[PDB]
Amino acid sequence: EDPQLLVRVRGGQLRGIRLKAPGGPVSAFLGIPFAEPPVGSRRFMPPEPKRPWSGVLDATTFQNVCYQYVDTLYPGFEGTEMWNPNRELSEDCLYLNVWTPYPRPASPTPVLIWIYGGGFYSGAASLDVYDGRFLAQVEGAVLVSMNYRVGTFGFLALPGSREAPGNVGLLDQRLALQWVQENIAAFGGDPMSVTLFGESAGAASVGMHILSLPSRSLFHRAVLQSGTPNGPWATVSAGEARRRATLLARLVGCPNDTELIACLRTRPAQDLVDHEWHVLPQESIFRFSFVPVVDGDFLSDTPEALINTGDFQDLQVLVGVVKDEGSYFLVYGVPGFSKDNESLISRAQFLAGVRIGVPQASDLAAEAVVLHYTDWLHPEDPTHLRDAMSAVVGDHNVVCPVAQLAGRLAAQGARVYAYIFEHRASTLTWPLWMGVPHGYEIEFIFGLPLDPSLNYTTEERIFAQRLMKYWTNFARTGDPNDPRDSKSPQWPPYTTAAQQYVSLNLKPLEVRRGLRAQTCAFWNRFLPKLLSA
Amino acid sequence: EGREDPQLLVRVRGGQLRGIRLKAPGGPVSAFLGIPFAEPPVGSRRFMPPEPKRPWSGVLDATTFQNVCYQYVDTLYPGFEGTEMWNPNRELSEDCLYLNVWTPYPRPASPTPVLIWIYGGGFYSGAASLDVYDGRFLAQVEGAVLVSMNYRVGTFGFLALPGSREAPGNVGLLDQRLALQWVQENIAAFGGDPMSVTLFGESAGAASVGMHILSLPSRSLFHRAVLQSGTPNGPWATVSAGEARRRATLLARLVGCPNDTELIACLRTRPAQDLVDHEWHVLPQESIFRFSFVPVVDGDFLSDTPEALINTGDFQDLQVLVGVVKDEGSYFLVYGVPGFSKDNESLISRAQFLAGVRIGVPQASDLAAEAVVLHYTDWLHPEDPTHLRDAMSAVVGDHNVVCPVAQLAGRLAAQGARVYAYIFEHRASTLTWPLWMGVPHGYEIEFIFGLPLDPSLNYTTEERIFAQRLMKYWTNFARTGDPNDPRDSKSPQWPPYTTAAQQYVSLNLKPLEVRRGLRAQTCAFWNRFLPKLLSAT
């Protein structure tokens, strides 16, 4: 049997499987356990490293998906399903995946580690969209992706308790990073060049690893696609975590901290997920029930405090957003919107919609939002109100958090590269009015167009290769620029002075300045003053 | 009479007048300068509403300009055409309620449309005799009858102890109403059509025109209105009865005069200069574009606040021309905002921009002041001295003119008014202020009145043709309620500003260009958001 598929890690022996990528084979090792199954009395608790095993462990299928809510808004429709889990659901989910060139790389090759999104409430590394074969085959890189516990299982927290101290979903991630140090070299990977890269709740996670001192020993570069540790959706405070947890328990019959969590532990998983979405304080979209918590442990203070004072003199970061961040979430809450019609909306609906999109907003601040996004040359135009409602949601939750993060990281000594992803997929299945929705750069970063049977267009293939090389160049060097290309489109560092980012689309690189600068001043500088008065 | 010119002798309701034959570039005009229309408001009549001028015997000589209402005289740059041209050019006296009349020579045989000019000057200065208010060119070239009156300014026009008989305030406006009454009764004697009367006025004068639109007694004395770079609404044009009462009793304390009757009576015994020497001293906060004594919302001349009246009144039977210059703000900065001067480029620091905002927007709380700075800042270049300077000019200009105007045009329009709106974009080649100030507040006036037609004034040939075009616009609007030429559809047309399309025209040396959105986004800030922010603080 094939020696390229046979690898010895500190915990046993692994048989991977050889996979065909469009222009070569790759070695894949799928379903490697990195922690003891967090079932039973281990539910809600920090993971423990995997006991050693006997024999040769099979690593050729994807393991089960962490237990999570499964979307039903559009049953059968491909643009929603593609995010739904494709393996069975289980609490027994702490496994990771590794792809690598075939043959195994001679010299040590940079590692890329991918943390999926899904609002800390869903997701899985086994999605077709996260296929690591292309990056491995084409760019010669070693790619690791992990599962982490999501929902109540990953982030339910009674802070200061021992039985549920919070953030265990992040600790799942952290163990996989320790595993990559202890084991990746056996695959050819370089433990001394590890890039984290993730999207949405993934990017938020990546950020939280930048902001937690024990994680900094485990990676060297980070990529934050369309998400941030800061902003309104990614963290709660200790007080609010305790409130949502004690309410979920009441909503499932339970019942002291120990008595309280112990009863939850005796509850079939679906009984907890049935009531997940039911503890949110106000009516919401782009607000999630269970998410990281400011515990003084993993997060010593709020990410806002931490980015505002940290020293990032060593860091290298690549941040960015898509053209239409907020459009995806509008169909999941905001009346008037729907994937099936044009979602032309009235001024009444737009006023109502802002209270949803900005649930924490007072009366005064929600009129401040309506007066800002309104085109007063066409104040009743159904098309502008629609596009603006989406802009509110995208800017409040993603684009302006990214702008604040990029600002502070760069100011505090980091090398930042900022982008905006402006190409919509020809394959895409949502209506035209959503433009480029939240999450549809990923298929291009993972090189999916290179598979000929996905019916992507030829320039999309050429586009995919440009991005695949921007990222892997970042991973190699901390600079997305080819060190052998002398074609003028160069990607400049983002700075506080010049605030320059580039646009990712089919045309060559174009350098722009200010990342919705006037509009982010409104969100980042003024509205904080407004609510606190 | 004998050997007198028989086209310069005219009888009015108060007696006979001898006028004068002026040379204009293209022929002569008749001018009647210094016609009294009220009893001089001296002595016990100070602060009182005007009384109609008792008739005189003999033939009154009306060939020179009369006195200027008692007023503060600017002394910022002494001997510099920029400031002097607005400074009073006759003797200062409380005896000052006189008006002037220009008419074609010979006086027209048909009944000619009338234009009545009301000068700006912040309700604290001004005179109908300034060289830029010269009716000789409008009268000669467009064939029109121009009337401009003196109205009392400062304490003497607007100091008010509301509710009292001795000082009911707003008498400065009641002067203007008397002159409008006068034009009704006597303008036929000069060939004028008392059924085609158009008020038109700049700044404080434009404000005044607005008060006449909003006051029912004035509404039968005119038919159309042009408001240039000023409004009755807005922050500076009016004060509440409470504020006027406070400013008056402090001015009394300041000159020695601590029941309202006894207080006013003491003030009546005070040299006119004593009052002028102290009016700048009762403003609540360190400000610019804030004026001590202005119209008061007395419930009489103005039944409610201007803001209330334009929201709710009917205006179908109304035609209005409104507009603004490009740089409304720049002139006021050098009179207050530290960092600004006519002699250097006025490149300020971000520190000075925050200091400035607190002055330009003196009613703003800390939070509102922050919102303004947040909005006017260029966040790609938040410390750029050139951008900061221009932004500071734009804050004063939008707060005080362009957004009251935009609110006025929008509010009138929605309620039946036919509205035309312009932005005046040409800087006079003869301008003496520095280049950074752009087209300052007040420097379209010389072009409406036609001064570039005077060869001695050293304008350009294009400025001459330009000034002719504007005179046609204004007077066509007086004649018809429409600045467009009937016998000319080739040249671009000037559409009415409606709420639905917010259309307005540029006025520059190039042909009319139609634009949409009178600072649409930024006036949402001032006319919509900031009132709510003041409200909830």
Ligand SMILES: *[C@@H]1O[C@H](CO)[C@@H](O)[C@H](O)[C@H]1NC(C)=O
């Ligand atoms: C689009 O469809 C949804 C559900 O079918 C509906 O609620 C919404 O009103 C529709 N929108 C328009 C603009 O017709």
Ligand SMILES: *[C@@H]1O[C@H](CO)[C@@H](O)[C@H](O)[C@H]1NC(C)=O
């Ligand atoms: C691509 O299109 C062809 C026909 O044009 C079809 O046979 C094939 O199944 C399609 N593949 C996908 C992934 O849509």
Ligand SMILES: *[C@@H]1O[C@H](CO)[C@@H](O)[C@H](O)[C@H]1NC(C)=O
């Ligand atoms: C311009 O001159 C005035 C007084 O002469 C001064 O106060 C101001 O600071 C100067 N501005 C600059 C930019 O030099």
Ligand SMILES: *[C@@H]1O[C@H](CO)[C@@H](O)[C@H](O)[C@H]1NC(C)=O
């Ligand atoms: C106009 O120009 C002439 C020619 O130089 C000059 O003598 C005169 O003083 C100037 N007058 C004005 C008002 O500029």
